[PDB]
Amino acid sequence: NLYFQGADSCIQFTRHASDVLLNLNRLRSRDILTDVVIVVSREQFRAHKTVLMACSGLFYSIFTDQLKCNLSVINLDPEINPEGFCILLDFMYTSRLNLREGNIMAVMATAMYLQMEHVVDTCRKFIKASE
Numbered sequence: 001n002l003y004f005q006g007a008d009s010c011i012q013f014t015r016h017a018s019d020v021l022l023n024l025n026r027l028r029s030r031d032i033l034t035d036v037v038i039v040v041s042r043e044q045f046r047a048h049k050t051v052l053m054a055c056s057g058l059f060y061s062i063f064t065d066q067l068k069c070n071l072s073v074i075n076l077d078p079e080i081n082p083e084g085f086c087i088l089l090d091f092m093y094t095s096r097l098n099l100r101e102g103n104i105m106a107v108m109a110t111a112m113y114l115q116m117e118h119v120v121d122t123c124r125k126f127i128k129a130s131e
């Protein structure tokens with residue numbers, strides 16, 4: 001699937017961006033070219049620094065710091081919920097946010113810590129609606 005757009009009339013591929021993420025998530029599943037371990041409450045999550053930086057203000061700041069960009073292990077605040085992190089990491093790699101009544105507060109807190117503004121705002125709206 002392709003279509004035209006812009007004063008260019010440039011060809012755009014509809015599924016290209018989502019296909020790239022699908023493939024990045026496959027690399028993560030197979031531990032191919034992963035270059036960082038994120039440690040949350042003694043659980044370990046392998047990932048790609050570029051994907052993290054593309055989705056999170058916190059990770060953008062870390063991995064653009066000339067000192068911290070060389071670390072292969074990054075520890076998060078030990079009060080961060082690991083399920084909250086796993087939900088957001090999955091979101092980064094898929095566009096899908098598995099928000100539920102039983103996890104929304106943890107996910108929101110985690111998204112605030114990671115500086116994922118669109119997710120925070122979304123959690124706020126869903127909390128607002130249920131009051």
Ligand SMILES: O=C(O)CCNc1cc(Nc2ccc3[nH]c(=O)[nH]c3c2)c(Cl)cc1[N+](=O)[O-]
Nearest residue numbers: 019020022023024025026027028029030031032
């Ligand atoms: O059967 C295959 O081609 C292997 C399928 N698996 C796979 C494929 C890719 N990239 C890939 C490969 C060939 C392509 N030809 C294209 O036009 N685009 C392509 C993208 C990545 Cl990055 C991870 C995985 N993976 O880890 O599973």
